[PDB]
Amino acid sequence: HKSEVAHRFKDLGEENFKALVLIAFAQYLQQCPFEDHVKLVNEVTEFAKTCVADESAENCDKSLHTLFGDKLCTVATLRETYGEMADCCAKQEPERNECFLQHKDDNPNLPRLVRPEVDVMCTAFHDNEETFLKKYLYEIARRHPYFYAPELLFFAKRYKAAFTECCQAADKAACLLPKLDELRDEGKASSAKQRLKCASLQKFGERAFKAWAVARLSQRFPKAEFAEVSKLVTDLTKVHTECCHGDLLECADDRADLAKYICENQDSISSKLKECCEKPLLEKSHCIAEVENDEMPADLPSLAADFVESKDVCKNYAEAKDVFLGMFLYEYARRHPDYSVVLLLRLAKTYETTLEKCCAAADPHECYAKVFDEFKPLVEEPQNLIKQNCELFEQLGEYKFQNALLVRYTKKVPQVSTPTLVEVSRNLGKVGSKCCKHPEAKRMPCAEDYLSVVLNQLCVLHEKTPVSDRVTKCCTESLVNRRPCFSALEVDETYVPKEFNAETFTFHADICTLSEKERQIKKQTALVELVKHKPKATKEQLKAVMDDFAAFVEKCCKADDKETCFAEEGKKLVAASQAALG
Template sequence: MEGLPQKYNFSHCCRKGDFERRLCFFHNKKADIGFLPPLPTLDPEEKCQTYKNNRESFLNNYVYEVSRRNPFVFAPTLLTVAARFEEMTKTCCEEQEKANCFRTKAEPFIYYLKALSSYQKNACGALMKFGPQILQFINIAVLSQKFPKIEFKQLTSLLEDVSSKYDGCCEGDVVQCIRGRSKVMSHICSKQDSISSKIKDCCEKKIPERGECIIYSNKDDRPNDLSLREAKFIESDNVCEKRDADQANFMAEFLYEYSRRHPELSTPELLRIAKVYEDLLKECCNMENPPGCYRHAENRFNETTEKSLKIVQRECEHFQNLGKDDLKYHYLINLTKLAPQLSTEELTFLGKEMVIALTTCCTLSEEFACVDNLVDLVLGELCGINENRNINPAVDHCCKTNFAFRRSCFESLEADKTYVPPSTSQGLFTFHADLCQAHNEELQRKKDRFLVNLVKLKPELAGEELWSLLADFTNVVEKCCKAQEPEACFKEESSKLAAKSQAA
């Protein structure tokens, strides 16, 4: 279209053709959408009237607003969100307490959108950075845990459809993405007797709802005749010969067998164990007595899981010892020191996501898998999906070196030594009386932004000093909003706080 490629800096993509053009657009998507205001919320009465007057225009506008704020979400997910939004609008417009109805019903599907957005972004990031094999391994782990009675041959056939779905969805080919998703779900439903006992109701639904239902269905029960360990990968004398005959298929089958036996482990942990096993065989198969070497594989797997478990326990201790807000500040400080190049919006979002992960998981019986899965998605958000990213080289190294072990790589990272803070405070210590009008949620957002920008300005400050300056900011707001002349009070207190931060 005339003028558009120049306006949005896509001219170089338009000179390419087909697949390369789509990929070029994908790599140049704006991952950071901090320039957009929060999703506009209409007055409930106005919302209902607009829907009544022109249903199509109302829904199109909603899809537009949601899509541009979620640039990497797959099309079928957006269609489901739109359908749920319409359902909610119909129901709430009949209610007396419309505002309350919208608020209550919107929460679960906003959470659903964010959860699937993170998962899809993470999967596509893995595909873009590490290639199709890692995505294949992620899908093997997820599907084998969900459908433990599926035969390996049947899983391999299903994975072909799953892979072509991701190709379309991750490249941004909307039509192929929708068709691919439908094909995967039809494949599962046509063989449901040999795949899972938990999806009968899902398979009776219409196509868009069917997919969501299967994704969120419970894991099937483990078959009674499934032994706790698969001996052929550890006790057999000809493991090295089998591996050498077809390494990709051999490793895929190992991951399938291990995953279906361990529903309690997270996807990243299953990938770590597969990597440990692969490295162990490289070592053992060059020895004089390979079976004597790889018979100790279980010990290596247990050691790997122990290390991951300790990281999760440490994070859940933070959750137990700090309140919700302090937990968030802890992560905002750490994440900003790690990747100060990211926008304030992205960093505050990541801090909140860490808190959601821990508050969701740290009280559950399946704490380990839940925390490890969700925190891995936050790291996926931090690493980003496309190439259009400016980030600390050490973080970049963790993001690109090894997908399965990036969590432990991040554990050992320190603050970015290459970062040069801004030379001025850029209005950080300029406060006005409008802070007194901010509601709790808005004020909380401003506190989060203040802390992140403070760390960006003063990355060398220790945690205690940063916490102290944040407490001072809270006290200034409280004091000045009670003062007779709030604006004058803010002016005076702002300069005191600026001076204190300078001296720190």
């Protein structure tokens, strides 16, 4: 059209427009103060209205990158504040934009945002709803420069709904606090995946991404033809590359096009898409990527027909290897919404290895006739891990379950730092209560989704401060062997127990006054240290001590006097325990 700005403004709306411009600026100029960005939003919004009124008004012809880049080069303190970035302004548009992206610090040194008290938040919320939500939106976006703007916006609205609903509530805190905690994990989760997918695209390459995509798309759109899914995988790939490069605009448009396409061919893709395709521009993509799995045909053949029994397997495979394998995945994935994507990838890989060995042999058909029997243990391994662990989780609670993981993993890798072992086990415990409440058919997909960010995140830490070659092995293994590699870690026999330190096992009454989350962490921290000191202790000896510790706490908190109790009894405990563990 004549004017891009006019257009976006029109089919986005002033409110969303202002919010997005704010986010965009906050993401590039992470150092400027809030009031400075607000001024810019106003100036750009005014500009936009001018173009809405006259498509032919001065500058309205300009493109968004050009417009955006100019206003950016407006900042006076630019060179004094961002040094090198200012040199970008000396370049022509294409390079200019490109130059800005390269100076977008993916993780600056800003203070960690602290959460104020419910009352202050609620009061601030009512006194000026807008600047309240905008300032935080500003704080969050400058700290997460690669977070897709429209999604950052979707979160903000949920946050607003929570304040509306809770700042009116009798027990404000009992209402809000838990809603905020949940919103945070989801936001941190969303953020981690975002970074995760792009890192993956980098390491593993396009081939691996396409495969991951085929499987994923097929589980969701089981009724679509392979031609459609191929078309989608291709476009989805252009979209991820684009979106990972960091260019918001190009990223947003590619996502827009892909959504409208899907919505138009909605009949040849899925039936669970009606709701999503009825929503406004800003939310279509988001809705679609979240859509529920559509139901499969029921009148579907057996894979063995076309992939095992049918002579020609090799002729068709040699004709177009990745395509044939893509077909295998499509076929296998859409009949199994219950498998994690990586499991599907492991089957496809096993099948590829086989076709490679068999198609170059005397009698093909007989060499690969029993390939499906190889899939069995591959499918059963993950299945049994879920079952065993979910059963254990039902017996104990999220808490006692977290302590079980603590003992278990401290033993595998004692070298690991205590605060890290506690962080990880608690998150694992969360995943436990999150996914174990689903029925078997949805358990594996669930665990995969959560376990992937947890696994990825723990690998980076170790990347920063390696402690074990074993972990490094698993962390640099193939995307398909990662989890299995970690599952295979057995007890570290080499390890030498930490020498006893009386301080580590000393407790004062300050634990009677502490809160749940605090008491637990302190108990769990002591637990890891206990195992690091006596790694050969049985699950029995250990439970014994833990039980003695159970009383100790009580027989000292609910006591006529703390301090003393924790000093007299405390000495007794260490002595007893020390003895019962050689």
